[PDB]
Protein backbone atom coordinates (compact mmCIF):
# COMPACT_ATOMS: atom_id res chain seq x y z
CA UNK A 1 0.00 0.00 0.00
CA UNK A 2 2.25 2.79 1.34
CA UNK A 3 5.47 2.82 -0.76
CA UNK A 4 8.81 1.35 0.30
CA UNK A 5 12.41 2.10 -0.46
CA UNK A 6 13.54 1.92 -4.07
CA UNK A 7 16.82 0.08 -4.61
CA UNK A 8 18.77 3.36 -4.84
CA UNK A 9 17.20 4.33 -1.52
CA UNK A 10 18.28 1.00 0.07
CA UNK A 11 21.76 1.98 -0.93
CA UNK A 12 21.38 5.45 0.69
CA UNK A 13 20.22 3.76 3.83
CA UNK A 14 23.06 1.33 4.10
CA UNK A 15 25.57 4.20 3.79
CA UNK A 16 23.77 6.37 6.25
CA UNK A 17 23.15 3.63 8.83
CA UNK A 18 26.82 2.57 8.73
CA UNK A 19 27.99 6.20 9.09
CA UNK A 20 25.83 6.61 12.16
CA UNK A 21 26.81 3.30 13.71
CA UNK A 22 30.48 3.84 13.11
CA UNK A 23 30.38 7.18 15.00
CA UNK A 24 27.95 6.36 17.81
CA UNK A 25 29.96 6.21 21.10
CA UNK A 26 30.44 2.68 22.48
CA UNK A 27 28.19 1.34 19.66
CA UNK A 28 25.07 -0.72 20.10
CA UNK A 29 25.96 -2.10 23.62
CA UNK A 30 26.61 1.33 25.19
CA UNK A 31 24.11 0.70 27.96
CA UNK A 32 26.45 -1.87 29.64
CA UNK A 33 29.09 0.73 30.35
CA UNK A 34 27.93 3.74 32.34
CA UNK A 35 29.01 5.84 35.23
CA UNK A 36 26.25 7.98 36.85
CA UNK A 37 27.51 11.48 37.36
CA UNK A 38 27.65 11.63 41.12
CA UNK A 39 24.83 13.18 43.25
CA UNK A 40 26.95 15.94 44.86
CA UNK A 41 27.75 17.37 41.37
CA UNK A 42 25.52 19.84 39.52
CA UNK A 43 23.38 20.63 42.51
CA UNK A 44 24.60 24.19 43.22
CA UNK A 45 24.35 26.79 40.35
CA UNK A 46 26.12 29.65 41.90
CA UNK A 47 28.79 31.14 39.60
CA UNK A 48 28.01 33.91 37.10
CA UNK A 49 29.20 33.64 33.45
CA UNK A 50 30.36 36.14 30.86
CA UNK A 51 26.88 35.65 29.23
CA UNK A 52 24.87 36.73 32.40
CA UNK A 53 23.85 33.34 33.76
CA UNK A 54 24.64 31.26 36.77
CA UNK A 55 26.01 27.77 36.46
CA UNK A 56 27.39 25.02 38.68
CA UNK A 57 30.85 25.32 37.24
CA UNK A 58 32.18 21.99 38.43
CA UNK A 59 29.44 20.38 36.38
CA UNK A 60 30.05 22.56 33.38
CA UNK A 61 33.68 21.40 33.49
CA UNK A 62 32.76 17.76 33.66
CA UNK A 63 30.60 18.31 30.56
CA UNK A 64 32.98 20.52 28.68
CA UNK A 65 35.66 17.83 29.16
CA UNK A 66 33.72 15.31 26.93
CA UNK A 67 32.09 17.57 24.43
CA UNK A 68 34.89 17.95 21.85
CA UNK A 69 35.05 14.24 21.04
CA UNK A 70 31.27 14.25 20.72
CA UNK A 71 31.50 17.04 18.20
CA UNK A 72 34.24 15.17 16.36
CA UNK A 73 31.94 12.19 15.99
CA UNK A 74 29.26 14.41 14.42
CA UNK A 75 31.77 15.62 11.93
CA UNK A 76 32.99 12.03 11.19
CA UNK A 77 29.38 11.11 10.55
CA UNK A 78 28.73 13.98 8.18
CA UNK A 79 31.86 13.32 6.16
CA UNK A 80 30.74 9.75 5.57
CA UNK A 81 27.61 10.90 3.65
CA UNK A 82 28.56 11.36 0.03
CA UNK A 83 25.99 14.01 -0.61
CA UNK A 84 27.60 16.06 2.17
CA UNK A 85 31.22 15.58 1.03
CA UNK A 86 30.48 16.88 -2.47
CA UNK A 87 29.54 20.23 -0.92
CA UNK A 88 32.02 23.11 -0.94
CA UNK A 89 34.15 23.53 2.11
CA UNK A 90 32.31 26.78 2.93
CA UNK A 91 28.93 25.17 3.06
CA UNK A 92 30.12 22.10 4.95
CA UNK A 93 31.25 24.22 7.81
CA UNK A 94 28.05 26.19 7.98
CA UNK A 95 25.95 23.05 7.93
CA UNK A 96 28.02 21.47 10.69
CA UNK A 97 28.09 24.40 13.05
CA UNK A 98 24.35 24.47 12.42
CA UNK A 99 23.29 20.92 13.35
CA UNK A 100 25.89 19.87 15.75
CA UNK A 101 23.65 20.42 18.84
CA UNK A 102 20.52 19.17 17.00
CA UNK A 103 22.49 15.91 16.55
CA UNK A 104 24.28 15.49 19.86
CA UNK A 105 20.86 16.22 21.47
CA UNK A 106 19.08 13.55 19.46
CA UNK A 107 21.97 11.22 20.20
CA UNK A 108 21.47 11.59 23.91
CA UNK A 109 17.72 11.53 23.74
CA UNK A 110 17.49 8.14 22.11
CA UNK A 111 19.75 6.95 24.92
CA UNK A 112 17.19 8.05 27.53
CA UNK A 113 16.90 5.47 30.32
CA UNK A 114 13.42 5.29 31.96
CA UNK A 115 14.77 2.77 34.54
CA UNK A 116 16.82 5.74 36.13
CA UNK A 117 15.36 8.81 34.40
CA UNK A 118 18.82 9.66 32.98
CA UNK A 119 20.15 10.78 29.66
CA UNK A 120 23.35 9.02 28.59
CA UNK A 121 26.04 11.25 27.21
CA UNK A 122 28.65 9.82 24.75
CA UNK A 123 27.42 6.31 25.73
CA UNK A 124 29.01 6.47 29.20
CA UNK A 125 27.86 9.45 31.39
CA UNK A 126 24.40 8.97 32.89
CA UNK A 127 22.91 12.33 33.95
CA UNK A 128 19.83 13.66 35.70
CA UNK A 129 17.69 16.57 34.39
CA UNK A 130 18.88 18.87 37.16
CA UNK A 131 22.65 18.21 36.68
CA UNK A 132 22.48 19.24 33.02
CA UNK A 133 20.11 22.14 33.73
CA UNK A 134 22.67 23.50 36.25
CA UNK A 135 25.62 22.60 34.12
CA UNK A 136 24.76 25.14 31.44
CA UNK A 137 21.68 24.13 29.43
CA UNK A 138 18.79 25.80 30.92
CA UNK A 139 15.41 24.93 29.94
CA UNK A 140 17.21 23.08 27.13
CA UNK A 141 17.84 20.31 29.62
CA UNK A 142 14.07 20.03 30.20
CA UNK A 143 13.43 19.98 26.43
CA UNK A 144 15.75 17.07 25.68
CA UNK A 145 14.42 14.95 28.50
CA UNK A 146 10.79 15.49 27.40
CA UNK A 147 12.00 14.30 23.99
CA UNK A 148 13.77 11.32 25.49
CA UNK A 149 10.61 10.17 27.20
CA UNK A 150 8.69 10.90 24.07
CA UNK A 151 10.91 8.67 21.88
CA UNK A 152 10.95 5.60 24.25
CA UNK A 153 7.63 4.81 22.65
CA UNK A 154 8.60 5.31 18.97
CA UNK A 155 11.35 2.70 19.42
CA UNK A 156 13.66 3.98 16.78
CA UNK A 157 16.33 1.90 15.18
CA UNK A 158 19.85 2.96 14.11
CA UNK A 159 18.55 3.51 10.56
CA UNK A 160 15.70 5.77 11.63
CA UNK A 161 18.08 7.72 13.79
CA UNK A 162 20.76 7.77 11.04
CA UNK A 163 18.32 9.17 8.55
CA UNK A 164 16.86 11.56 11.03
CA UNK A 165 20.41 12.92 11.53
CA UNK A 166 20.94 13.45 7.77
CA UNK A 167 17.71 15.41 7.57
CA UNK A 168 18.97 17.66 10.37
CA UNK A 169 22.34 18.11 8.68
CA UNK A 170 21.14 19.05 5.20
CA UNK A 171 18.95 21.96 6.40
CA UNK A 172 18.51 24.65 3.88
CA UNK A 173 17.69 27.06 6.75
CA UNK A 174 21.11 28.61 7.53
CA UNK A 175 22.70 32.00 6.80
CA UNK A 176 25.45 31.98 4.16
CA UNK A 177 25.11 28.87 1.97
CA UNK A 178 26.53 28.90 -1.60
CA UNK A 179 24.99 25.66 -3.05
CA UNK A 180 21.48 25.97 -1.61
CA UNK A 181 19.83 23.97 -4.40
CA UNK A 182 22.13 20.93 -3.91
CA UNK A 183 21.45 20.86 -0.22
CA UNK A 184 17.69 20.95 -0.80
CA UNK A 185 17.88 18.05 -3.34
CA UNK A 186 19.79 15.99 -0.84
CA UNK A 187 17.42 16.87 2.01
CA UNK A 188 14.52 15.82 -0.20
CA UNK A 189 16.24 12.51 -1.08
CA UNK A 190 16.86 11.71 2.57
CA UNK A 191 13.30 12.69 3.62
CA UNK A 192 11.75 10.53 1.02
CA UNK A 193 13.91 7.44 1.83
CA UNK A 194 13.19 8.04 5.50
CA UNK A 195 9.39 8.16 4.89
CA UNK A 196 9.65 5.00 2.88
CA UNK A 197 11.74 3.16 5.49
CA UNK A 198 9.14 4.07 8.04
CA UNK A 199 6.47 2.51 5.82
CA UNK A 200 8.53 -0.64 5.57
CA UNK A 201 8.37 -0.96 9.38
CA UNK A 202 4.74 -1.47 10.36
CA UNK A 203 4.85 0.69 13.38
CA UNK A 204 2.14 -0.23 15.92
CA UNK A 205 1.41 3.53 16.31
CA UNK A 206 -1.02 5.66 14.34
CA UNK A 207 0.32 8.63 12.46
CA UNK A 208 3.87 7.64 13.15
CA UNK A 209 5.47 9.49 10.33
CA UNK A 210 3.91 12.88 10.88
CA UNK A 211 4.29 12.59 14.67
CA UNK A 212 7.99 11.94 14.06
CA UNK A 213 8.41 14.95 11.63
CA UNK A 214 7.22 17.00 14.56
CA UNK A 215 10.28 15.99 16.59
CA UNK A 216 12.39 17.60 13.86
CA UNK A 217 10.95 20.95 14.86
CA UNK A 218 11.77 20.19 18.56
CA UNK A 219 15.34 19.41 17.68
CA UNK A 220 15.77 22.52 15.56
CA UNK A 221 14.41 24.39 18.64
CA UNK A 222 17.04 22.90 20.83
CA UNK A 223 19.68 23.80 18.28
CA UNK A 224 18.48 27.37 18.07
CA UNK A 225 18.60 27.91 21.88
CA UNK A 226 22.06 26.52 22.39
CA UNK A 227 23.83 27.81 19.33
CA UNK A 228 26.49 30.09 20.87
CA UNK A 229 29.20 27.56 21.61
CA UNK A 230 29.47 26.32 18.06
CA UNK A 231 32.27 28.46 16.55
CA UNK A 232 33.86 25.03 16.58
CA UNK A 233 36.87 24.09 14.44
CA UNK A 234 35.71 22.08 11.32
CA UNK A 235 38.79 20.79 9.38
CA UNK A 236 37.51 20.78 5.80
N1 LIG B 1 25.39 12.12 24.14
C1 LIG B 1 25.65 12.62 22.81
C2 LIG B 1 26.70 13.70 22.94
C3 LIG B 1 26.39 14.79 23.94
C4 LIG B 1 27.39 15.33 24.71
C5 LIG B 1 27.18 16.34 25.64
I1 LIG B 1 28.71 17.18 26.83
C6 LIG B 1 25.85 16.89 25.79
O1 LIG B 1 25.58 17.91 26.66
C7 LIG B 1 25.92 19.25 26.49
C8 LIG B 1 26.03 19.88 25.25
C9 LIG B 1 26.37 21.24 25.15
C10 LIG B 1 26.61 22.00 26.27
O2 LIG B 1 26.94 23.31 26.24
C11 LIG B 1 26.52 21.37 27.57
I2 LIG B 1 26.88 22.54 29.28
C12 LIG B 1 26.18 20.00 27.63
C13 LIG B 1 24.82 16.31 24.96
I3 LIG B 1 22.82 17.00 25.12
C14 LIG B 1 25.14 15.29 24.06
C15 LIG B 1 26.23 11.54 21.92
O3 LIG B 1 25.79 10.37 21.98
O4 LIG B 1 27.15 11.86 21.14
Residue numbers in the entry: 156 to 391
Study authors write:
Receptor occupancy by a ligand (T3) promotes the dissociation of this corepressor complex with the relief of transcriptional repression and mediates the recruitment of a protein complex containing coactivators (e.g., NCoA-1/SRC-1, NCoA-2/GRIP-1, and NCoA-3/ACTR) with chromatin-remodeling activity, inducing the transcription of target genes. Mutations in thyroid hormone receptor α (TRα), a ligand-inducible transcription factor, cause resistance to thyroid hormone α (RTHα).
Accordingly, to model the human TRα mutants, we crystallized an artificial mutant receptor (P393GX) which was truncated at the carboxy terminus of helix 11. Importantly, the P393GX TRα shows similar molecular behavior to the human TRα mutants. Small crystals of P393GX in complex with T3 were obtained which diffracted to 3.0 Å. However, despite having the potential to form a complete helix 11 (aa 363 to 393), in the P393GX mutant TRα this helix terminates at Ala 379, with the peptide backbone turning at this point to form an extended coil which runs antiparallel to the adjacent helix 5 toward the corepressor-binding site. The T3 ligand could be placed unambiguously in the hydrophobic cavity of P393GX TRα LBD and binds very similarly to its occupancy of wild-type receptor LBD. However, T3 interactions with Met 388 and Phe 401 are lost and the orientation of His 381 is altered. Arg 384 makes a new interaction with the ligand in the P393GX LBD, donating a hydrogen bond to the 4′ hydroxyl of the outer ring of T3. Remarkably, given that so much of the receptor carboxy terminus is missing, the ligand binding cavity in P393GX mutant TRα is almost completely enclosed due to the rearrangement of the carboxy-terminal portion of helix 11.
